[PDB]
Each structure stands twice: as structure tokens, then as C-alpha cells.
Amino acid sequence: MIIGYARVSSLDQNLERQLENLKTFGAEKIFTEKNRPILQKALNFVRMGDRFIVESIDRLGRNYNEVIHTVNYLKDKEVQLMITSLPMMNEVIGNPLLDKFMKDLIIQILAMVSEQERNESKRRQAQGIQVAKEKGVYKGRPLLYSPNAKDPQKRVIYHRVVEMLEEGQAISKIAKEVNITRQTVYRIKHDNG
Amino acid sequence: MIIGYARVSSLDQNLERQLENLKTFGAEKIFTEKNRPILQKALNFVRMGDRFIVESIDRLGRNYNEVIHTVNYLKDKEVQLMITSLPMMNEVIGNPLLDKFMKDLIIQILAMVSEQERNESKQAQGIQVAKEKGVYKGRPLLYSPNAKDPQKRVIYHRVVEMLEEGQAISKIAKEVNITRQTVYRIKHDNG
Amino acid sequence: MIIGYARVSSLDQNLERQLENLKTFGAEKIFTEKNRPILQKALNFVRMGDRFIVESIDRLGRNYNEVIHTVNYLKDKEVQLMITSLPMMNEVIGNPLLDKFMKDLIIQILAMVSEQERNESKRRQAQGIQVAKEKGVYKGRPLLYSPNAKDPQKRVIYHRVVEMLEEGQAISKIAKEVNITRQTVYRIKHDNG
Amino acid sequence: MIIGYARVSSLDQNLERQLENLKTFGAEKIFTEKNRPILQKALNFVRMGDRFIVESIDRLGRNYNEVIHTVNYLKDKEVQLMITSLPMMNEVIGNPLLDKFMKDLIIQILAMVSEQERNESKQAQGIQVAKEKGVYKGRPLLYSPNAKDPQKRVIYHRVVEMLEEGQAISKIAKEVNITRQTVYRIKHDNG
DNA sequence: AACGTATGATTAGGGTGTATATTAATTTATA
DNA sequence: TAAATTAATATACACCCTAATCATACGTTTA
DNA sequence: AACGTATGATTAGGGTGTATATTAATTTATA
DNA sequence: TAAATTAATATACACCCTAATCATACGTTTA
């Protein structure tokens, strides 16, 4: 049993035409939406063997995700899905594959879209990083002990290290006195000049 | 003639694999994107009878509306479109009648999604017919040439200069005591 | 009528002795504190002509400020105040004029004390400033436009001024362009080197 | 012999006025404080029979207990004490019986006030018989020699050094990323 | 018009104290 | 553990110092 | 013992995006 | 005034980059 479903788009307020359209494709019974509850009602009405007709994909849901649900539904209840606006929906519909086909493809595409958004986050991040990484921004860790250094205290330490170098102290002593690695002290040394 | 087209996603930098996968589907000749000009080149290369292969919808355009253009292009030049991840496309392929259909469908689905994502984040284009055709509403730019306080003006410029100089956002912000979000704003706006 | 008032100090818990002591000076009726409400009671009891006896100043209040109140009270109701611990206290109040006296002096002193704490604030402050002012710390206003300068933006401005100087632009133009005084620009000039 | 003693209060820097104000009461010889050593000097100068003049109680000591000492001293050496802002004292100094009395009284009043102000703010002296005669309670000094983290030790010292060098508190704080109160703590503790 | 140079006011960057509610680190009582 | 106890920190309130700047003005020299 | 010099791990100072509740500044509707 | 509307700011959440440092070890040279 052929079933239609219409719902006036706020940009396309005409109804009647839409209706006629539907019948023009066989719509025997037609639900009309005044949350879209009617829709659900219609979907519950149809069953294996019937054909559900609508003018355009978007009439199957307020957002893509929902469309998926809708289509899925029909797919399981094994109801033919027919969409008016599609050129040649007519000659093709008679193809043994087209149904299963159209249904799946729609789902796919759509899903391939959601998991594009669920990553819009990182994507733009990774996108930005890369751009930067190209500009030569990421430069590892900056000196932890040296003037300018973030933490003012380390600045103090840095200086004392130096002072202790001019004072001619011994590396080992410097290290222990400032709780630093020898290597590090050396770095401060061959760095000072 | 089977033709592939690859372009490394910033999140998926591997290339080689992508390549092989293309060949795995028949790609004889393969164009690689290093604006996406290569793409346009590949599209011009193909012609009635060939098959254009790609890994995923998005490789056909930076934004959906471009994809539409792409797909539409192929549809008219009558080139088979094949997407590595919507494998079933394989079937219908080879029956000139159904091929159109797919494209046609692919289009509608996308064209639709182009709203559900376009009617959500509403806009630096309304500042060319409201501020360039009258007087703009809301607070005025604090940092930009013209700006009331001359010093801000100076700052604005330095921000820019530092952008061309390719400096990092964070550094700019701190150097000018501004928010990143603001520097951003100065960025998008410059153009 | 001679009236005494006792209240055991937590450091001096003996009572009885204190009592005797009071009587030893004439206490006919004696109030004993077990907020110090009894005290207020006793104070209300006395009247012009009576003598209020206590062992020590502090028995007149929980803090100096209160003692003042107490004493002031007695002074107005014209009640003789006597304090035991004072050497020659009798020899003293055996004169009628040494009453007015003691009362006033106490008040004075005490007041001259509160008005010492009332300023303990500014005192230590002014005290500290001075020390510093001596150490040569206070150094006026530091440069507003120059590298290092507090506000990063002005730092930016400073530089641009310079740049515009090397670029050989004119003072006046610099000034207007950076919303600064000529004098100031000159300062930046006659400074750079 | 009438003797005065002046010392400019940091809140009342005028000197000269204070001086005359002393002479206005008879001050023949006047000692001026530039620890208060002059004061002690003046006190040693006076002899039974003389009168010691000062503007206000507080000029007799840095803290109350010292005043007591001062007053007591004068009381024994039998020197008249006369305080400028408690003018009514003049009415009586003549007679030595009322003189003692006043002092005696002045003492009690003060001795008293010495509690109402001593039993309120409850101490860097209990760290010489608890931490220098056992083990100290509470958190350990974070900045001080001995301190666990060696770097902290280094900082501590620099704070000190900067104190002797006579630097300003605020600067010290910022330079060592410490709180002012903390720097204070290091100050009072040093000695 | 810019430049060069003054002069009295206002000022922003720096200072001096004090005090309280929190969050550390330790030793020392319970349960 | 759960106290008890003392160090730091984070914040506020209150108000002090003083050379840079600002606002101004006024001859003189460059455009 | 220090010095001189390596080598693999961990890391702290720097980065990249995004998003929300507030507090600015303006123009533009009311009442 | 009271909206309405757009700029900045102040903060958080999420997670990426990478040369200094740390921890280590191991011959060699100074005390």
C-alpha cells in the first residue's frame, strides 16, 4: 500500500502542490504534519510490502542523524522508500537492487558525515598545529635556568651558579649546592660568554 | 581509464597507504595534492568513460558546496565516481542509468547536510552591507586602523606585522597583552 | 556609705583575703563578682556621698576603655573612688580635693593611651616608610614608555617611536601617531644611545 | 634642675616645636634623641631634686615595660616626673608625697594596660626553647638554611643578602617569588 | 608650521603597614 | 585516622612617594 | 674523588583549537 | 531610560611539541 507524507517547509509553504505531487506518484493514504509526531505515526503505519513516499530527504528528519534513524527503520521493516525530487526515481525504482542500495548508501554517506563532525574538534587542532609546526614555532623546552626564565627563583639559582663559577668553585660542589646536574652546570658554563 | 586522487588529511598523514589503497581499486594514474589545484587538474584530465577514484567524499572539496561542484562536474563529463569507503557504489557502477542516480542522490544528501551545518554557526560577511552600506551595530572594533585611540591603532598593526612575520599566536597575545581570541579576530578579518 | 567590690583574678584566686583587705579600709557592704554584671550592680547602688573601694584599677573593667567608663561614671555620680594597693591611698583621700584629682588623672592617662593605639596603624606605617625613605627606596615614577615598562603595550609603542626615529620621521608626526607628547618623544630620543 | 628630653615621633616630625614646648615648662637643659641611648644618658644625668620633663608617656620607652623601668628609675632616684600633655600634674609635683603617688599610679595604670594589649596578639622567642631544646611543632620553615630543598636554602640566603643590601621588601618578594609576609618573617627571624 | 625648551599639575608605577580565610607540612594524640 | 600547630599563600583594606607625563605656553627656525 | 663526556627518559615551558559567562561600547527602540 | 547587538576579556577544557634537564654510567685525570 503506497503511503505518502508531507510537511510544509517554512521556505516552501504551499502544501496542496506537495500533496498533489505525492499522489502523482501513487500515494494512496497521506499523512500530513501540522518534533514531527505525525511522521512517527506514519512510519508505524507502514509495514513490509508498502511503499513510503516523500518529496525530499529532509522530510525524513529534522537533522541528518534522524534521517538515518528513519531510513534505518524503513530498511528493517522492509518498506520501499521512494523520494520524489530525485530525477528518475521512477525508472530506477523498478530495479531489484536500487532499494536495498539507496537505503544503505544514504545511511553510509550520512554516517561518514557525523564521524566527520565528532572529530571537527581535533581536526582543526591538528590542522592548526601542523600549520604552525611548518612555520617553525614549536621549539622544544626553553632554558629552565638562565635569566629571563619563567620561574623567578630559578633565575636566582642560575645567577648563583655563575657567581660560584667566577668565584672559581668546583663543579661537583656547585651541583650539590644548587641541586642541579653537573651537565647542567656545564651547560651554564660554556654558555656564559 | 581508472584515475585516482589522493591528498593527505592533516589528521591522517600517511600518503603511501592512501596511494596503495587507491591502486588496490584500480587506480592506473594517480594525482597527488601537495586551494587544491592538483585536484582541478585531475578533474580536467578525466573524460567520458574513465573512473575517478578517491578514498572519501571530503577529498572532493574543502567544503560540501565544493563537493557538489566536483560531483556535478563528473556527472556531466559522464565520469564514473568511485569512493573507497562507500564500496557498494561498485555495484550500480557500470549501468549509466543508475550512476547518474547515485551522484544525483549523493548530491541531495550533501546539499541537505549543507543546511543542518549552515543554519547553526551564524558571520563576517554581514559587515560589507551593514558597515559598508550604512552604520554597523554593536561595539566598535577596539583594535584596527581608524579605531578611536591612536595607540590601539599602533598595536593593531604590530599584531598584523607579527602575523605576516609568521609569529605564533600565543607569543603575539602576550607581546601585545591581548587575548588569543582577539588576535584570531584580527587574523580572519585581515583579507 | 563605704562600698567594696571584689573579683578574684584567675592568677590570684583567694577571695577571702581580698574581702578582709576591703573591710580593712572600711568596706561596709561588699559586692562580689562570681561580662561583670555584679560590678554594674554595685555601681548603680552607690550614690553621691559614698565611697567605692576596690583593690586595683583592673577590677573596674575588662579592659582600659571600660575602666575609663567606670571611673567616669563614679566621677559624675560624685562617688569617692579609692584603690587599695596604692601606697598612702588613705593619706590621699583624707583630703577631699585629691578625689577630683585622682579621678581625672586616671581618665587622662588612659585616654592618652587609647589615642596612642588609635594611631598604632599609621605609626608603624610611617615608621616603616621613613626607614625605607632613608634607604633610598622611593624613586618616583619609572619610565612609562621604554622596554621593560610594566604595560607590554607601551613597550610596543616605545619601540615604534624609536623605529620611527631611525626611519627619520618628524617629531610632530611621531607624537600624533602615538598619542604622546613631543617632550616625551624627545626623552625617548635623547635617551636612545 | 629642670631637664627635658625630646624625641621626634615618626608621625610627629617637627622637633623645634617640641623643644620650645619643653622650655615652656622650664626645661633648662635638654637632651635630644637622634635603642634610645640619649634617653638613658639624660636619666643618668638627673639627681635627687631635679625635675625630668617630657611631652608624653611614650617618650619614656619604646614599649610599656620599658616605661615602667624608666618611671621606676626616676622614682628611686627621687626625681620629679612631669609630663607635658597631662598638664594637671604641675598642680601637684611640689609636694613629694603626691609625686610618688602619681608615678605609682601611672605605673599601675600602665602595668594594667600592658595586659589588655599583651593578652590579645598571641611569638618568635618560643623558638629557642622548643626548637633549640627539642623538636619544633607545626610545619617546618620552607625558606631558611637547613631547609629540606637545597634550592630553597639558596633563595633564603639571597633574601637576606638583599636585606642587608638594603633593598625594598616589594622588590625582594617579586624577585624571589615569595610573599611579603614571608620576607618579613625572614627579616624578624634574622638576628 | 615644526623645532627647542620651559613650567606647574596630575599620575601611574612603586612602597609601607595590617589582617583573614585557606592549604600546606609535621608532630602527637586517640580509637 | 583525627587533632593540633605553625608556614606559606592568596587577597583586601589603607594610604604614602615622586619623577614621568600631560597640558600649556612662547620665542625661533625650517618649509 | 672530581672531571669530561655520553645516552635514553621524563618534563616544564610553549603551542594549537574550542566554548561560555561577563563587562564593555554603540545604535536604536520605547515610554 | 531600556533594549539590542557586537568586542574584548577572563577562564576552562583538551590535548600537542620538543630541547632542557634528570638519572645513569664510564673511562680519565687531578688531590
Residue numbers in the entry:
A (entry chain E), C (entry chain C): 1 to 34, 42 to 200
B (entry chain F), D (entry chain D): 1 to 34, 42 to 129, 132 to 200
Please share excerpts from the published article on this structure:
It is thought to stabilize plasmids by resolving dimers into monomers.
To address these issues, we have solved the crystal structure of a wild-type (WT) Sin dimer bound to a site II duplex. The site II-bound Sin dimer is markedly asymmetric, reflecting the requirement for the CTDs to dock with DNA repeat motifs in a head-to-tail configuration. However, in the Sin-site II complex, the bends in helix E are more drastic and asymmetric than those seen in γδ-site I complexes and only one E helix is inserted into the minor groove. The catalytic serines are >12 Å from the DNA and are partially blocked from it by the E helix of the other monomer. The duplexes cross each other at a ∼60° angle to form a negative node and are <10 Å apart.
